[PDB]
């Protein structure tokens, strides 16, 4: 039996598909990959998760380690923070860092913005994600705090993808895509151990960001997650 | 010696290159990857290949395991089966499953269609591929059975590519790309074994399919090839 | 404090971003990957690097092994050497091989051309890269020897990227992207050894090059780097 039926799409879905194709026809997107060893983050979460809950009443997750390491890399290379506006053919630098965090709730995808990430620590980031996660869950999430982001983390790794290519939020110039954590054999010190590792991806605008600047950017995020004490040093 | 000569391209190759660029300018294509362990398929082919040839006069291959697992995943998530027609800005659902199989013969690529995959088993799929493989080999393959497919398998793995990005057949919304089988060290149960594994890819339309629905789709194909008894269960 | 300031981009950067978007809107780019074992190249550099420096006054690097293996693969499949000109809708074959080498100096990226690679050896290629590397370093590099290339090597592996997708130099049809060398566990002979391996990528025009011809091309480059004695044989 061969049955097909035409259901229509509303005017809201019209604009979402319209903005999506404008993001590809504007900027020349490329993608680069790397690989992060997640051993120093898990034992940080293994021994300090109990004193964190008693003192702050929050959960200690992986997400706050990637947001704080992203604000560290952006303030070192400001060209990734930049945006090309094709109205006056201008290059708009910024001096503030607002990282948008895609948190997929039951309803669907929402992309709220964490404001002024430069001065925070892990305790401040965890407050911001938790209470704003409750806002969008019961649908009280405003429009005015969903725009103006300068960089975007995309957790598509809570479902188990190995690696993949993300899509740029069109008022920005780059996006980081984190993925699932698997145990794979690793050659460390000339021996074959098993360590939990993650593939990461970075989709960047090649009109603005150089091919070597995107590699150095993603290599700097790796150093601040394989060893989070670099945030206190250089 | 610097010699170059202009040979022309015919009007048939004109349209093939024309349809190819229309597939990129219409839909916003992204790609996601995963990894399948092919151990339960090979020992199925190791002990039952002799009773299969005596009783059916056919060869037992890898291809029929991917076609039957693809019809299983499509009937669970019908949104991958859908197509956006931009004539009336409509979303066309379908209730039938027709998987197109790219079988590269000596002449070149051909993409015939297997009709009504929902009711078949491995024995029915193997008859359909084998006799239709003989039709396109001696060039009696009609035009009327090359169109109307809803999903596409692309075996580019008979040449030995590791992984790569396929291209969407433009009346469809997704495509699966299987690749070569290599023996790689695998961390299973806390120990380092060697098991034959395959990388797979899924190129999807981001106008229609969500970013989390493409990950769940490819994760469901993996469960029906790492353990083919799920086709009898849920 | 929220400060942003508009700095302009000059008319040279206007055209670079203009040519970049024309390369995507012309040709349908896809990407395929593979993996090369770099053991036979390093012990060639381990024992012959001293007699090479005494006799030629040059350094023995990895780059000359990829340029000579690329001219070997291009003269076997001339369709990768071809270019589609959309002025008269023509397919322009060539009989000469000019490989462009992107050598990122302190100033930035430059892409000079090595002319007539068919007759050279490793000693001739190393002379051409070394003295022309000194020209672009002190900025005496002419314009007339930066155009007319037919194939492009892109070393983005001196910074440590795992793998990624390159961009086609628009008068060409393909580009090879080499990457960083890491020690990873390898299943060889049924045992788990540790060997230095590299991921490589090939971005090709799907209007002209078939999907199976790009896989066979990159598989042929692998055979001439895993065993460089094939250059004397077939």
Curated annotation (Swiss-Prot), chains A, B, C:
Main localization of the protein described in the UniProt heading: mitochondrion
Modification type N6-acetyllysine: residues: 49, 54-55, 59, 89
Location within or outside the cell: Mitochondrion matrix; Nucleus
GO MF terms held by the record: dihydrolipoyllysine-residue succinyltransferase activity
Catalytic activity from the UniProt record: N(6)-[(R)-dihydrolipoyl]-L-lysyl-[protein] + succinyl-CoA = N(6)-[(R)-S(8)-succinyldihydrolipoyl]-L-lysyl-[protein] + CoA
Keyword presence, Nucleotide-binding: no
Pathway entry: Amino-acid degradation; L-lysine degradation via saccharopine pathway; glutaryl-CoA from L-lysine: step 6/6; Carbohydrate metabolism; tricarboxylic acid cycle
Coiled coil: none
Uppermost EC category: transferase
Cellular component aspect of the GO annotation: mitochondrial matrix; mitochondrion; nucleus; oxoglutarate dehydrogenase complex
Region annotation (Catalytic) ranges: 1-233
Cofactors: (R)-lipoate
GO biological process, one term: 2-oxoglutarate metabolic process
Keywords associated with the record: Acetylation, Acyltransferase, Lipoyl, Mitochondrion, Nucleus, Phosphoprotein, Transferase, Transit peptide, Tricarboxylic acid cycle
EC number: 2.3.1.61
Active site residues per record: 206, 210
Note on how the cofactor is bound: Binds 1 lipoyl cofactor covalently.
Function per UniProt: Dihydrolipoamide succinyltransferase (E2) component of the 2-oxoglutarate dehydrogenase complex. The 2-oxoglutarate dehydrogenase complex catalyzes the overall conversion of 2-oxoglutarate to succinyl-CoA and CO(2). The 2-oxoglutarate dehydrogenase complex is mainly active in the mitochondrion. A fraction of the 2-oxoglutarate dehydrogenase complex also localizes in the nucleus and is required for lysine succinylation of histones: associates with KAT2A on chromatin and provides succinyl-CoA to histone succinyltransferase KAT2A.
Assembly description: The 2-oxoglutarate dehydrogenase complex is composed of OGDH (2-oxoglutarate dehydrogenase; E1), DLST (dihydrolipoamide succinyltransferase; E2), DLD (dihydrolipoamide dehydrogenase; E3) and the assembly factor KGD4. It contains multiple copies of the three enzymatic components (E1, E2 and E3). In the nucleus, the 2-oxoglutarate dehydrogenase complex associates with KAT2A. Interacts with ABHD11; this interaction maintains the functional lipoylation of the 2-oxoglutarate dehydrogenase complex.
Family to which this protein belongs: Belongs to the 2-oxoacid dehydrogenase family.
Protein name: Dihydrolipoyllysine-residue succinyltransferase component of 2-oxoglutarate dehydrogenase complex, mitochondrial
Organism of provenance: Sus scrofa (Pig)
Lineage of the organism: Eukaryota, Metazoa, Chordata, Craniata, Vertebrata
Shown stretch of the complete protein: 221 to 454 of 455
């Amino acid at each position: 039996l061969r049955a097909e039926h035409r259901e229509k799409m509303n005017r809201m879905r019209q604009r979402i598909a319209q903005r999506l194709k404008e993001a590809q026809n504007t900027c020349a997107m490329l993608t680069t990959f790397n690989e992060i060893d997640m051993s120093n983050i898990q034992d940080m979460r293994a021994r300090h998760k109990e004193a964190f809950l008693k003192k702050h009443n929050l959960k200690l997750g992986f997400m706050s380690a990637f947001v704080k390491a992203s604000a560290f890399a952006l303030q070192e290379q400001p060209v990734v923070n930049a945006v090309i506006d094709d109205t006056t053919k201008e290059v708009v630098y910024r001096d503030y860092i607002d990282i948008s965090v895609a948190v997929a709730t039951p309803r669907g995808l929402v992309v709220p913005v964490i404001r002024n990430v430069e001065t925070m620590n892990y305790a401040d980031i965890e407050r911001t994600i938790s209470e704003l996660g409750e806002k969008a869950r019961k649908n009280e999430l405003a429009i005015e705090d969903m725009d103006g982001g300068t960089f975007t983390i995309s957790n598509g790794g809570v479902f188990g993808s190995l690696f993949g290519t993300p899509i740029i939020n069109p008022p920005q110039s780059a996006i980081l895509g984190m993925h699932a954590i698997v145990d794979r054999p690793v050659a460390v010190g000339g021996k074959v151990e098993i360590r939990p590792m993650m593939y990461v991806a970075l989709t960047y605008d090649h009109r603005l960001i150089d091919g070597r600047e995107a590699v150095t950017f993603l290599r700097k995020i790796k150093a601040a997650v394989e060893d989070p004490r670099v945030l206190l040093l250089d």
